[model samples]
Every structure is written in C-alpha cells, then in structure tokens.
Target: STSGRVAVEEVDEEGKFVRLRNKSNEDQSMGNWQIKRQNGDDPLLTYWFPPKFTLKAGQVVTIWAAGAGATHSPPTDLVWKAQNTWGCGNSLRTALINSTGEEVAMRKLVRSVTVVED
Candidate 1:
C-alpha cells in the first residue's frame, strides 16, 4: 500500500513518553511532522520531528519527555527536549499531525489519582 498508516500507539503520562507506530506496509517519512499535547483547553505543547526522519513499515518510535532520565536513540527512540514533563489533568490530550498540518491520530489520557512517589 502506498498510503502510510501511522498512529499514536500509546501515551504514558507517568512514564512521560509517547509511542507512535507505522502500521502500514509502506515506510513513512515523518519529517516535519509534529506531536502536540494539551490539558483541557490549555496551550498546546508541540514537538516537531527531525527533517530527515523516517519510520519504516511496522516499526515503532518513542518520544520521551526531557528531564525524566530518558535516553534518545535516533530513528526509533527520540527525546522531546523542549519540555521536562507532560501535562497533568483529567483531560490530557495528545495528537499526531502530519507535515501538511493534518491531524492523523489522537490519544486522550486521564491522570490517575494514585501518584508515584519519587
């Protein structure tokens, strides 16, 4: 199939990471693509993919929030260095946007009441 099937596979608030998967038979170029988030109606937090990044078919990529002791591995595991933490609230929403500015996939997560003490 020529059409790429990329989607937000998971959003881990406690782990401060987001996972994306390309479920199609064809590889997908995610250059200039974006991952955005918001808590309720708050301002959006956006992170753009590297210009030359590509996700192979049936592959997964993980983007981790900075300052969470996460490591970045290129073309697979990435790091969102602009932010140290993810949004917290009852309505934590995340979306994947293509290079042309179209929303491709979204994931909504609610904060759990039980907090993990550091």
Candidate 2:
C-alpha cells in the first residue's frame, strides 16, 4: 500500500511546500520543503499563500496566482495544493516552487522540517 512513485508540484507561500517521494521510503525526492511553525493553525497563518500569488521565497510578501502555472505529463498528484493541472502527456504547468529558494532554505534551516531528499 505504501510503495509507489508520485508526482507533486507547488509554489507554496509558506506553509505549503512541494515534493514527490516514494511510498515505502520515508525519505524520497521532494521539492523544497519548509515549516514555519512547529505546530498549530498559526502555521497556516504564517504560511499564508496569497491569491494571485506571484511565488518567491519569503523574499516577496505579495503573491499572485494570476500567473501560477505548471505542466505535467500525467494527471496524477498526491494533493492539489497550489493550482490545477495542465493534464497528462503535457509539461505540468506550475509556478516555480520556492522560486526565491527560501522554501528550500527554510526546510534546511529548520531541524524540525523533515523530508526524503533522494
């Protein structure tokens, strides 16, 4: 039940990160993962993803999904986090996840944030 490959794409404003990993392996390929709050809904507020979100690390306070887009070859995903899919057999249209590289950094910076970097 837990041994399969998956695809994921995201441009999280904060709380929402992105990555794809194997089912069995706890540690697998993942996009830049990050965690601002250790726990609580506050994390939700802290990791606020702006609508019309123009993704960038913590570098930009303003987010505009008006341009959020990605292309993926296979209409399969773990969770529909950011935007919708572009459909299968096509380049997944997605805004650059962690474009500012902050998402990735925040993960690395925080010891609590865990992921499978395969």
Candidate 3:
C-alpha cells in the first residue's frame, strides 16, 4: 500500500505525540487512512483521516494523544483521546511503529504503494 511511503519522523511517548512525514515527490491523499493506537496485542484507539486531507511531499503532521492542541503550527494539530496516555515506555516503543509497516489499514491509496518509521 502507498501508506508505507509515509515515514515516522518523530514520536514522543512521554509527550504522547506522533509525527508522520511524506517523503515522496507527489501529494498523498489520506482521506480514509487511520491512525491507530496499540495496547499490547490489541488496537486501543483509532482515528480516521479528515476529508480531503492532502500530504504534499516533505510535509509532516503531528498527532497529539492528549493535552491542548498546538497553538500555532503548520500541518495543524491533531489530537487523540487516550484511555491513560500513550503509555510508551522503555520496552514498548515499537507499539506505534509496527513491523507491519504503516499504521493505517484498508484505506484507498491514490498512488505509489509502499510501506515504516524513524
């Protein structure tokens, strides 16, 4: 899936944030893509992509699991409601950057199917 082309640029488990960046040369539409949260072996939360959202190359988007959204920021600020924070620790960093590649699933990609993290 083209979803894998989006790489993980930054992750802050303590801060409950995840930033994904598009590395391709063309724009990537993620209208139905999903942002998922992993709790051990289960998906704890999931957020669908906003309508008509296009991620141009070199663009990055930040999703906050909790707290107030970014006051002034490009890519805007996306927020997520957590049951008890992202809870990332020394032994659970890979929860967000799964080996299966992109955190999204079953979303229709426009082009360049590829699929990781920083």
Candidate 4:
C-alpha cells in the first residue's frame, strides 16, 4: 500500500477483487467510497482502509469489497458509510483484465482480518 497508489487485481474482462483493510477503534471515523470503470488506463475498482473507522473494544476490523456489480457495485451495501467525515478515500479498481480469464464472482470478497488496538 504505497502513499497514493491503490493496489488492484484483474478478474477477467469484466471485473476484479479489491481489498480495503482498515484498522481503527469504534470512536474513530472514515470514508465515503465508490466503484468506477477504468479507461484502459486506470482501474475498475478500488479500496483504501483508514484508521477513523471505529472498532469494538477488543474486536478487529478489516473492510473489503469484491466482484463488480453488473461490472460495478456500490460499497455502501457492504459497509456503513462515515457518520460525517472527510473525502471518500481510496479505490481498488481493476487495472488489467484477461479476456480469457474467468470474471470474478460479483460481490465475492477475500479479505484478511485486522487486529484491534487501543
């Protein structure tokens, strides 16, 4: 996870799997996210986890979204948006797609869990 770059994995000619791993306590706040289509240049999906997202005292948090909805899907359905925070953070859009590869399952995410800290 570089400073300005959002890592992306192509899941075929139609979609991909994106991960947005977050680490924050319940009192913290973060994000307003969205999915987009690439122009054969950037990407079709993206995810960037922030520290403002609240966590349950001893519980961990790792937020993520996978599969493109009809080639695009809204992240809000998967997770609640910020109560009233700054700009919508990063995106994990797909940068490349192999026409021969199988399209990733729409709405299927593969994310690793995060350990909570106080």
lDDT string, candidate 4, 1-99, tens digits: 112112222222222233332222332223322333332334333333333333232233322333223232233223323312111223222321112
| Whole-model Cα lDDT of every candidate shown, in order | 0.84, 0.28, 0.55, 0.29
Q: 19-105, model 1: which lDDT tens digit per residue?
A: 999999889998999998987788889988989999999999999888668778998889887688776668888898989988888
Off by over 4 Å in 3: 41-43, 72-74, 81-84, 90-118
How far off is residue 118 in model 1, in Å?
44
lDDT of 3 by residue, 76-104 (tens): 56666443355454322322222334553
lDDT head-to-head 1 vs 4, winner: 1
Which is the winner by lDDT between candidate 1 and candidate 3? 1
Per-residue lDDT over 1-118 for candidate 2, one digit per residue giving the tens place of the 0 to 100 score:
3222222223343323343322232433223422232222122212233233222222222222222343332212223344232122112222222323343332111224457979
TM-score, one value per model: 0.86, 0.20, 0.61, 0.23
Which portions of model 4 miss their true places by more than 4 Å? 1-16, 23-28, 33-118
Error of 4 at 102 (Å): 33
By lDDT, the candidates rank as 1, 3, 4, 2
Best by lDDT: 1
What are the root-mean-square deviations of the candidates from the true structure over C-alphas? Answer: 6.5, 16.0, 9.9, 15.7
TM-score of decoy 4: 0.23
Which has the higher lDDT value, candidate number 3 or candidate number 4?
Answer: 3
